[PDB]
């Protein structure tokens, strides 16, 4: 009642009158209370931060297993929080609100189940939102009363207090078994697993939802079939297990190779049970590797792939403002290695192919003396045998990886086939360099000298760091705005505590054995250890970092790997590195 | 005086009081008058549209050649307007304004000289801007008086009335000789020309300015050297002329191949005289061709490259919501052909390489029966001999195009070399399908049925069409926001006059012999003829189209080819096509 009474008594008064709200709590329903955290300056501006809280109506026993929240599996807690968020949003599609304003901004999840600051299960369910308070320049009492009483209150009462305890419990189970399966891949002796009956294709070019119509379910070649009995559902699933080493994915155009590789890329994530890619997992450290022309690089050793540059330019400590296709990809590989990646994913179409192979005709035209590039084909075995680093590759034009392949697959009309033997036969009927101990200090002094601040995430595509744009359009395993919001935050903290935080983070990271994953479960350099500290700390700090440089509201952050954090900083154009 | 007096007498009064401005003209200086066109609703909103006018202080005789503006060469008029705009902006860097607010928004040009609605030479110089009128919710009289009196007035008086008549005249000459050279390429028997002494490289990965330091000037191989005496400067320049047919650009990594191809891509444009790429020209219809995964296609015949798709899917009238690498590239090629392109530019790194070639080992694994893709290598000669369509290609991995090549170039440390003979030798020491008469009606009925409007350009990267995002991030010859603003406008007009405009445009386009180029100088289907009408009309209408669906201010539009207009519509996901 009170809040409505309030919005009544201010119905016409001046907008600044709203400031009285700040920090206050209002029962707008029996089950729904509403704290204001912040109040907007004008109606035009970014809305007031709000926190809404309602209670567990489901049983911590059935759903979380443990009696009290602290003792619960963080993976189930995260999956639950991901369910509640989805329910909330679905509530709009089912027209639950008596009135729909569009003044509410709550983070929208992806197909993936991530830890986010948006929905919290506390010791009691809290949701963080921005509400654009209605108001010509005086308060709209009734505009606002609708938002809270006839949009939010019912929404929460219904799709949240009123959530389906059974639906939730099955959501948590599916998410948990996915995590089980991925975190058992290594032990079981695999590098990837594609579950039979999976629906790999998406519904459109700009969709991440499964194909509705005529999707051809994935079926494992009989020779690669694996089984895993999931602990929580108790169900036993079969699929294709890929062993350590080099896997080739071959086949004609439009036969699904890239569609399969994509599912693999995002196999470091758990999905919504009906995503179609559930139980399609890969090594948690898997990195999509691609050419990235024109990107900048600082202090990366790519001499395993590139030597003898024009004018004797160092590849041992490579530094450009304008990468080519081959040196950007080699830089990506070497940065992936430093950040901990044990599995490389490649797709011929986005590869700098001159990096990949060179036929004999070409070597005649352009002899190795004229050619800085050492092909990947001559290094892939080095990486795998000496360093435990596997590769999966979609290939078209060339078959000269057949010899190195441990698995060669052929795709015909979306069907997978094991053609390893035939591959090897064709190979006969025809015709360490890496060092785990990388040398790199991030140089905060050099990197930050031009900073005039503001650090903000821009969609999924970039970070605005002062007068600098960090381009993430080709860091392709970034999946949610919240992740970018996450990256933009250590950056701001990395900068705001400029002197003490870098040595702190770098020391922190050297110590660690386990890094937190995006689903919440918990080769070296100064740089990577720092990065490993960048977000060990951010995860302890529960994903949000209040610093003078950060202007992000509460509840718009999503977990990301340390690999992606390092990904962003590697691509900062002011970046300076040292020894 | 008056306007200041005005902004004084309203200094504290309510913001709505500003509406009195609208449509009024104010002499804020002897040489500078200022019409308001529009006034913002609130201070927060997008600013008031303003038009400022000052006079020719330079001589139409020396600069434009003709006595009166109407009779002047549109290319010189456009170049002049491009100079004045640049001068205006430079005025900020040289701190000309006594006060710099940041409330002024004028379109910023690129390195390229384009026709724009921003600066107009009329029969008298007019500039179109948005000014964010300062104002808590009441007018800022002094905030505003600064903007006009101490920022704009001096700016225009100084870098515009006070422009360097000699600098301008040399700008116009350079631009005109560039246009002369490109529009004489065909006649002279070439397809591209790279002027000796050109500075191809850019200064950074995210810059379009020439490299400052240690740039290695382009030098033509002696065997390809051409000369052209420019009519207006009277200067004679030399460089590399590329003949019709297939040119290969080969060479090691980091040797400048992509840097050269890029200069070629944008060689359909005129640049600022000190750009470094001036007199680096190609066929005006040149199109960069690349893979574009996941894009949508409707009604394109790609059967020259793709046949036998899974489940008997038509390639004769190809239609997906999710293109693969090979079918999107083939679709790009076929769309380019339909839109009139006589010159194809390709770069191995962004190619779907399985489209490009397949080695023998691969054909053993995956026989043609399993392979929908017919390689480009088997079609390039068809295109060139039968249809006059040339190709220039950066290639790395494979040398199987050597046989078809008419010119093979090798790049070593940024030096170009003619290795055609040696290429051919290696080729020996080893080992029509297109139909000009394309069948396609745009179907306005099918395409527009989901439109709930608003059409707006988003940077250089996309168009927002109702609840649809047209993705242009890989239409790579788009160079200015204004071009996107241009495309977004026929779309809105195409839609707003839904019934009568499509048959009108399509008829208009069938009639035409000459299409206007971005610098202002003036294979078939229903679709392309429509497109050729889309912007014959937009150019007559002087680039701006007032329709209920368009909310773009005056003076933020830039010319684009019809090819790019068609480029955008081909990529609309609701697009429906017919016969
Ligand atoms: N298993 C599948 N079932 C149904 N459709 C699929 C399947 N895999 C891919 N597709 C669809 O067919 C198209 C071709 O797939 P893609 O993997 O891109 O081919 P390529 O082998 O060239 O990578 C895609 O646009 C996708 O939407
Ligand atoms: N003529 C030149 N003079 C000086 N630097 C150049 C020149 N051409 C290219 N570069 C620089 O060297 C790098 C390699 O050029 P690029 O064309 O990308 O190599 P690639 O042959 O692999 O395409 C680019 O980042 C560019 O900035
Ligand atoms: Hg709640
Ligand atoms: Hg877990
Ligand atoms: Hg499941
Ligand atoms: Hg398995
Ligand atoms: Hg590859
Ligand atoms: Hg086989
Ligand atoms: Hg983290
Ligand atoms: Hg923050
Ligand atoms: Hg002027
Ligand atoms: Hg001209
Ligand atoms: Hg010039
Ligand atoms: Hg020439
Ligand atoms: Hg190519
Ligand atoms: Hg040569
Ligand atoms: Hg046009
Ligand atoms: Hg308009
Ligand atoms: Mg492929
Ligand atoms: Mg290249």
Residue numbers in the entry:
A (entry chain A), B (entry chain A): 52 to 174, 185 to 196, 198 to 493, 505 to 525, 533 to 602, 609 to 665
The authors write:
In vivo experiments suggest that MRB1590 effects editing of several mitochondrial mRNA transcripts, in particular that encoding subunit 6 of ATPase synthase (A6). Structural studies showed that MRB1590 contains an ABC-like ATPase domain, which is embedded between N- and C-terminal domains that harbor novel folds.
The structure was refined to final Rwork/Rfree values of 20.4%/26.2% to 2.6 Å resolution. In fact, although no nucleotide was added to MRB1590 prior to crystallization, electron density for an ADP molecule was found in this central domain. As noted, although no nucleotide was provided in the crystallization setups, an ADP molecule was found in the structure. Specifically, the two-fold related Phe95 side chains stack together as do the side chains of Arg199.
